[PDB]
Design a protein around this ligand. Structure first.
Ligand SMILES: C=CCO[C@]1(C(=O)O)C[C@@H](O)[C@@H](O)[C@@H]([C@H](O)CO[C@]2(C(=O)O)C[C@@H](O)[C@@H](O)[C@@H]([C@H](O)CO)O2)O1
Ligand SMILES: [Mg+2]
Lengths: 221, 215
């Protein structure tokens, strides 16, 4: 099972520097080019640069946009790819992916990115890292609509689950909205009236920028 | 190299055919390998990109016949023979003949039959009021098209301030939208009044749908 996992993302002050990591497994790390790609919120993908496989000397090549700013390196013993970001600013606020590029020297070779990481969001601001507060949403039929109201967090993002992933149908997460420097979103689930309140209903709010998980059980009034 | 896509977005009905363009500034044809170094990626909301087509026309393991990449040199085309609900995503083309460069992207949206919202209203929670906060939420669930209006009334007067609306992404299963309209007050502003109303106006009907509650 090929796996790519980005780490290091969060909130960085403007002008400062940040290093991202990308742990790999499931393939012969040294056989592959590794590429970094970024994506600002609601924008197009941007390739940033890569580092080649062992056979090619592990040389680096970058995109015009980040020459002299972004640096790529790799630890070949732990099979980890790296991205160094210096003099960060607003335009750098984006989701950063690592991707498995080509291996032309050994094995199966075709032009394309077969595997991408889940991504790690970096936001460049001077503001404050503040975890979200979670309030329940309950009615004042044959089915009933519940949900969790999430306010007062920064930066993005937050992820909302229900029953720890077991409840996945009828789930509607609305986009976030920005006001007074703080974000807010509400996720709602719909279930048969027999499932609630007789049975348990929980939402799992996660805010990676503060290493936080909040749980909120939905109870009647 | 410069990559450029068209259209930036388009909407079609399930079963309809669709075509997306990709253009580069320099031929992506490698004389040494005799192959066009262009790939198509699919990216659904909140996910990572997934590779669909590579070397211009070769389909990647697991991707349906419906998808068909064509082109050579500087003009390429991704073509879905028949779109269904899953295809909700932005499609990116990427050249790799000289380093790598992505296109701008084509967002694929779906047209479906008109649908009316199911409207729920929610009084503020206890723990929020305990912290001096009062947020009233109106939820519009499973409608189409996406354009919809919500009016708030307190005791018979249309409120406008402290209101924030937010939509979801087009649903991957029935291609509808849901939206929330939040009225945010302080515990004092809220205990000041009693009647709270939200009315959803949508093309589906002339007269808005009403949901209310009394503190
Ligand atoms: C002529 C340039 C490079 O040739 C070598 C090399 O000098 O290392 C040797 C060649 O036999 C061949 O292995 C190429 C290799 O195909 C280059 O691959 C890249 C690259 O920059 O490393 C990446 C590929 O995806 C593609 O962009 C090619 C490009 O088509 C030019 O060949 O370059 O390396
Ligand atoms: Mg070189």
């Amino acid at each position: 099972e090929v796996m790519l996992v980005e780490s290091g993302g969060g909130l960085v002050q403007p002008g400062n520097s940040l290093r991202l990591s990308c742990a790999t497994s499931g393939f012969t790390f040294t056989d592959y080019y590794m590429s970094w790609v970024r994506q600002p919120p609601g924008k197009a993908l941007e390739w940033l640069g890569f580092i080649r496989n062992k056979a090619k000397g592990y040389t680096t090549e970058y995109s015009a946009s980040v020459k002299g700013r972004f640096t790529i390196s790799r630890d070949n013993s732990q099979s980890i790819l790296y991205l160094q970001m210096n003099t960060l600013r607003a335009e750098d606020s984006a989701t950063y992916y690592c991707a498995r590029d080509i291996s032309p020297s050994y094995g199966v070779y075709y032009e394309g990115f077969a595997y991408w990481g889940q991504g790690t969001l970096v936001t460049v601001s001077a503001a404050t890292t503040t975890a979200p507060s979670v309030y329940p949403l309950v009615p004042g039929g044959s089915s009933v609509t519940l949900g969790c109201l999430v306010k007062g967090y920064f930066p993005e993002p937050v992820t909302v689950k229900w029953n720890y992933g077991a409840l996945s149908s009828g789930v509607r997460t609305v986009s976030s909205v920005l006001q007074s420097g703080f974000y807010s979103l509400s996720s709602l689930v719909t279930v048969p009236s027999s499932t609630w309140p007789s049975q348990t209903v929980i939402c799992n709010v996660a805010h990676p920028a503060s290493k936080t998980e909040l749980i909120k059980r939905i109870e009647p009034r | 190299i410069v990559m450029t896509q068209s259209p930036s977005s388009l909407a079609v009905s399930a079963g309809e055919k669709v075509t997306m363009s990709c253009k580069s500034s320099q031929s992506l044809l490698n004389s040494r390998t005799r192959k066009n170094y262009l790939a198509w990626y699919q990216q659904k909301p909140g996910q990572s990109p997934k590779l669909l087509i590579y070397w211009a026309s070769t389909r990647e393991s697991g991707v349906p016949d419906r998808f068909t990449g064509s082109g050579s040199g500087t003009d390429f085309t991704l073509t879905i023979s028949s779109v269904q609900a899953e295809d909700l995503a932005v499609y990116y083309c990427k050249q790799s003949n000289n380093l790598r460069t992505f296109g701008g992207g084509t967002k694929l949206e779906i047209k479906r039959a008109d649908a009316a919202p199911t409207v729920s209203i929610f009084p503020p929670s206890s723990e929020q009021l305990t912290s001096g906060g009062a947020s009233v939420v109106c939820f519009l669930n499973n409608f189409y098209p996406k354009d919809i209006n919500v009016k708030w009334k307190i005791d018979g007067s249309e409120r406008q301030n402290g209101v924030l609306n937010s939509w979801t992404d087009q649903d991957s299963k029935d291609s509808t939208y849901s939206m929330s309209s939040t009225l945010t007050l302080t515990k004092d502003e809220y205990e000041r009044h009693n009647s709270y109303t939200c009315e959803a106006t949508h093309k589906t009907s002339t007269s808005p749908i009403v949901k209310s509650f009394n503190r």
